[PDB]
């Protein structure tokens, strides 16, 4: 009773101290500084390829580290790997559970991972001895649907689920090496830092948390956005990240400044953002929307420059290649488009 | 280069082999009908099943295949994992019609499912699952529907009502007032793209898969008549 109230007051007082410290380190807004840099111009990309082999809506795609191979997941129970240069599809893996929600490509390209409403992260050894693709492991420690997964090595993968927690798995042993807790709602997406020493996570509580992989502690929490956060991505230099929520706006956060830097919103968009990605130099921020089309934002002036159109349904996935040459966009119309 | 030409030949051969299987899968996929079965604790939706994260059940009626999915491995918040069912043929909503205390909750959940941007096209096959207990509750008279639904006192049995031969007229008025509450929600916003199919049901009701089959005929029939632009 009294102790809980005293703790609540202390937490509120401490929270006020954090706000005061954050506002102290506010010299100028990134918009004010970027007044002397030249406008980016008008970005006009065109569909170079169209990948059409999926029966149902596509939920997630992930590029390979060679910038040529990518994997995609469709809710018909299929997991296709495409050669984006020739449009030819290399693999078509049938999934035990039809309701997949995420797919991941190993950095080495030796494995592919997926998961969904089955509350499991299945791992497939693409480069099998016999040439087939078979389930290599089944990670079954989450109580809640799998929302995202990103390989850290060929033996470590970090996963987020609708049970409000993220996990770090040891595929060789198949058990959670570390569990990340602190999110109040479903965790929807995670993004790995370039050094892979720490990652950011977005959940259905309008907050994003910076997680230390080795320590297993929440280093930093970023409170922005009004509704659920659906997408999160790191800045190429790893000192910033961007998020997209259902409140129809994207935000840029800085790890070192502990502050939000820019908000990418226009009065003509009232739909949620399903995916976000950065350009190779971090100058363009591409965001997929529920209005069936993507947007290209100037990540330094917040001015929209470019619009990708040509999907019949909502855009669910969005990814730029490692070399930064092309961007892939999936949608609920069951097609993937390459733009460049 | 000869090696390069051979390399691309294998890629085109591999793509051809995959595309052959994808065509076989597409035929099976569109000949099967996927159903979302959702209810509540007391709904009795388990008894309607007369065969971890999600439970699956397959039944066959007139050689047609149906796939029912019960999501029982998630938490109480469902605003994210329910978007995965924007392509199902129908949503099977099971509500216990004997519990007036938990009956407004079912109306709220039904209203959310109806007015959802990503479920705005799916039709709902509604099952009012406990009518033997509802009849017993009404006949006893200890519990009054008017305490929880004030407008029941002013409700009269529909003229098109078809009471089962030999059931008390008091029960018939209670059955249709519960039915009407879900139909008022369904017809308030649905602009001819999805419809509700109410059914009165009990535990000993053997003829429940047939009703789903008949309602699935209606759903697919409307879509085909829409594709031909005859409706």
């Amino acid at each position, epitope marked *: 009773q009294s102790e809980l109230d005293q703790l609540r007051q202390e937490a509120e007082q401490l929270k006020n101290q954090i706000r005061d410290a954050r506002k102290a380190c506010a010299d100028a807004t990134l918009s004010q500084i970027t007044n002397n840099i030249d406008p980016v111009g008008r970005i006009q990309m065109r569909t170079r390829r169209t990948l059409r082999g999926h029966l149902a809506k596509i939920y997630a795609m992930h590029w390979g580290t060679d910038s040529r191979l990518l994997v995609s997941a469709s809710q018909d129970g299929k997991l296709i790997i495409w050669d984006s240069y020739t449009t030819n599809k290399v693999h078509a893996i049938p999934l035990r559970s039809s309701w997949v929600m995420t797919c991941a490509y190993a950095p080495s390209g030796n494995y592919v991972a997926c998961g969904g409403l089955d509350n499991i992260c299945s791992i497939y050894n693409l480069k099998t001895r016999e040439g087939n693709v078979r389930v290599s492991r089944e990670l079954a420690g989450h109580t809640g649907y799998l929302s995202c997964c990103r390989f850290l090595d060929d033996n470590q993968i970090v996963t987020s689920s609708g049970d409000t927690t993220c996990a770090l798995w040891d595929i060789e042993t198949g058990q959670q090496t570390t569990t990340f807790t602190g999110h*109040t*709602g479903d965790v929807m997406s995670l993004s790995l830092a370039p050094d892979t020493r720490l990652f950011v996570s977005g959940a*259905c*509580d*309008a*907050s994003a948390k910076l997680w230390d992989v080795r320590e297993g502690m929440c280093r930093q929490t970023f*409170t922005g956005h*009004e*509704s*659920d956060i659906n997408a999160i991505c790191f800045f190429p230099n790893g000192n910033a990240f961007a998020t997209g929520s*259902d*409140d*129809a706006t994207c935000r840029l956060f800085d790890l070192r400044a502990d502050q939000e830097l820019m908000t990418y919103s226009h009065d003509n968009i*009232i739909c*949620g953002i399903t995916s976000v990605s950065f350009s190779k130099s971090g100058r363009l921020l591409l965001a997929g929307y529920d209005d069936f089309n993507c947007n290209v934002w100037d990540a330094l002036k917040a001015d929209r420059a470019g619009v990708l159109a040509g999907h019949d349904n909502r855009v669910s996935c969005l990814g730029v290649t490692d070399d930064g040459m092309a961007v892939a966009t999936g949608s609920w119309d069951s097609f993937l488009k390459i733009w460049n | 280069t000869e090696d390069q030409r051979n390399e691309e030949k294998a890629q085109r051969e591999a793509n051809k082999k995959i595309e052959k299987q994808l065509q076989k899968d597409k035929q099976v996929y569109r000949a099967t009908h996927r159903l979302l079965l959702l209810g509540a604790d007391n709904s009795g939706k388990s008894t309607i099943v007369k065969q971890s994260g999600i439970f699956e059940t397959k039944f066959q009626v007139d050689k047609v295949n149906f796939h029912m999915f019960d999501v029982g491995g998630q*938490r*109480d*918040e*469902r*605003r994210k994992w*329910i978007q995965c069912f924007n392509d199902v043929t129908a949503i099977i909503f099971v509500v216990d019609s004997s519990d007036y205390n938990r009956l*407004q*909750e079912a109306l*709220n959940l039904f*209203k*959310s*499912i*109806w*007015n*959802n*941007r990503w479920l705005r096209t799916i039709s709902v096959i509604l099952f009012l699952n406990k009518q033997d207990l509802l009849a017993e509750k009404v006949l006893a008279g200890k519990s009054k529907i008017e*305490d*929880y*639904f*004030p407008e029941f006192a002013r409700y009269t049995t529909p003229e098109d009502a078809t009471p089962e031969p030999g059931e008390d007229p008091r029960v018939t008025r209670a059955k249709y007032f519960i039915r009407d509450e879900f139909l008022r929600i369904s017809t308030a916003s649905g602009d001819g793209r999805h419809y509700c199919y109410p059914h009165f049901t009990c535990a000993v009701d053997t003829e429940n898969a047939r009703r789903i089959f008949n309602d699935c005929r209606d759903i697919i029939q409307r879509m085909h008549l829409r594709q031909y632009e005859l409706l």
Partner: nanobody
Amino acid sequence: QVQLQESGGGLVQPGGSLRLSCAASGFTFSNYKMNWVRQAPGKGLEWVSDISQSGASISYTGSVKGRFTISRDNAKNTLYLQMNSLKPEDTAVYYCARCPAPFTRDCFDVTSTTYAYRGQGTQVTVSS
């Protein structure tokens, strides 16, 4: 940050009246439908009433219909619930909850055990 603070009342006698206020900050109040929920002692959370973005679409629960009134003042970002003729069954903790997303009519998961966009709640007690 999204926060909802409710300032209601305490102990009242049967047949009395009470006014609950919910001061909301951290989001555009005008773009969301607002709900009022309660949790009776030894019972789960239940939906009481909700008001629409412009206030033109009101709705109440069957038990409280005719006695409770819900209104909002979008200019001041506040939500109200005027309760009259309180009954012994009305004793509970009332929470001011917000719909998950803006410009929507459906509001999923507002009665869930743990919901991010819900207030701490204010205790309303009625006894002799």
